[PDB]
């Protein structure tokens, strides 16, 4: 999976930097203003960002980004100001400072729900970066920014690590993998997106059926309705008309869920004996979210087996879609279709860049108009000193 280098227009980034003012004046002006506890504009910090020329200068910016998040005008962070800091990071580091700010979403609050996620991902790919690529993909899911047509690119590299992972996952790992596949998987056009949705459902069903349901939706934008296993069977019931599926990784993971539950029920001392942290605390703090009328998910295991067993045989008769090539079929999506989608955002990139240019002129003329207004008022006040 690769992204074409066509979406690299550093010439436009050249025109973004237009202020060209010394950082000592900007840093001193805002530090004095913050000591007075007085609001500051997004223009001042943006000028500080646009005048970055060293890695030490970026550390000053991220410190000021942290303090501007605690400024009274934190919500007024312009899209381009975050974007400019991304480009400055991509010149020198491109690996650590951008990810660290994204890891501390609350403290800094850059939140770049733009094409820069693809640009940040693309440079990770061009440097053969995997461990950090997974983390930034997860944090995109937290911001749920899988909206652009190029969302296929993000969907690919999650599936790449699915092949590469051979490990007994943990409580958080299973939840993250399902969340990073369920919501990002939206390509009804392709069967690979449908397979990922089934794969994500099975992971959440393992999470829900084994320990609990509350932590599935605690920190992530998921649905708190129970019964995720029954939410995956309906997808396999949609194949009555839809002729495309992955069905390779979905069946393998469903069998793993089937194997785990078929041993958990008869062997309580083997699979259900793992939880041994606290007994008195758990009982006292136990919260029962489900009602009495709601059927227990444990009692739905025979119901799940009866429906699941018949469905798999039926789909093979007419679906005609059983292959592991989804690793390569999805790979060719970005190598061929994405360049067209890459050109789709080229014009949009100009539009967003042009809008930022208009706002910067508007912001600069806004400040200048009041600057002469203040001095005209000040000169008039001193010329005719009238006070009560």
């Amino acid at each position: 999976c690769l992204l074409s280098a066509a979406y690299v227009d550093s010439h436009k980034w050249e025109a973004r930097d237009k202020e060209d003012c010394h950082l000592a004046d900007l840093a001193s002006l805002m530090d004095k203003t913050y000591e007075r506890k007085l609001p500051v504009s997004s223009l001042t910090i943006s000028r500080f960002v646009d005048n970055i020329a060293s890695r030490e200068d970026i550390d000053h910016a991220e410190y000021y980004l942290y303090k501007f998040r605690h400024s009274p005008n934190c919500w007024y962070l312009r899209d381009w100001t975050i974007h400019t800091w991304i480009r400055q990071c991509l010149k020198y580091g491109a690996q650590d400072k951008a990810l660290y700010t994204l890891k501390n979403k609350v403290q800094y609050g850059i939140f770049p729900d733009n094409y820069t996620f693809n640009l940040l991902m693309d440079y990770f790919i061009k440097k053969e970066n995997y461990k950090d690529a997974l983390s930034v993909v997860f944090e995109i899911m937290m911001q749920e920014a899988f909206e652009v047509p190029s969302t296929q690119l993000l969907s690919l590299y999650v599936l790449y690590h699915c092949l590469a992972e051979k490990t007994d996952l943990s409580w958080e790992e299973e939840r993250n993998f399902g969340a990073s596949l369920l919501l990002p998987g939206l390509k009804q056009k392709n069967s690979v997106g449908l397979s990922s949705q089934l794969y994500g459902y099975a992971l959440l069903g393992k999470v829900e059926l084994q320990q609990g349901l509350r932590a599935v939706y605690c920190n992530m934008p998921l649905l708190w309705q129970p019964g995720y296993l029954h939410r995956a069977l309906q997808v396999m019931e949609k194949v009555a008309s839809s002729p495309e599926d992955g069905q390779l990784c979905g069946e393998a993971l469903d069998v793993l869920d089937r194997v785990l539950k078929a041993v958990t029920a008869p062997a309580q001392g083997t699979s259900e004996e793992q939880p041994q942290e606290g007994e008195e605390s758990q009982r006292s703090e136990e919260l029962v979210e489900q009602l009495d009328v709601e059927e227990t998910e444990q009692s739905k295991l025979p119901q799940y087996l009866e429906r699941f067993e018949a469905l798999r045989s039926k789909l093979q008769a007419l679906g005609k879609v059983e292959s592991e090539s989804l690793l390569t079929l999805s790979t060719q999506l970005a190598k061929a279709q994405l360049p067209t989608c890459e050109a789709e955002d080229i014009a949009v990139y100009e539009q967003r860049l042009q809008q930022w240019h208009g706002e910067r002129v508007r912001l600069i003329q806004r400040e200048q108009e009041q600057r002469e207004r203040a001095r005209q008022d000040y000169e008039a006040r001193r010329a005719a000193k009238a006070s009560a």
Binding site: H22, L23, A24, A27, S28, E56, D59, H60, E62, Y63, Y66, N104, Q107
Partner: peptide, 15 residues
């Protein structure tokens, strides 16, 4: 646990 960044110095010797 998040640790706030230390206070840096942005004064330049040029001026």
């Amino acid at each position: 646990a998040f640790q706030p960044p230390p206070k840096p110095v942005i004064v330049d010797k040029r001026r």
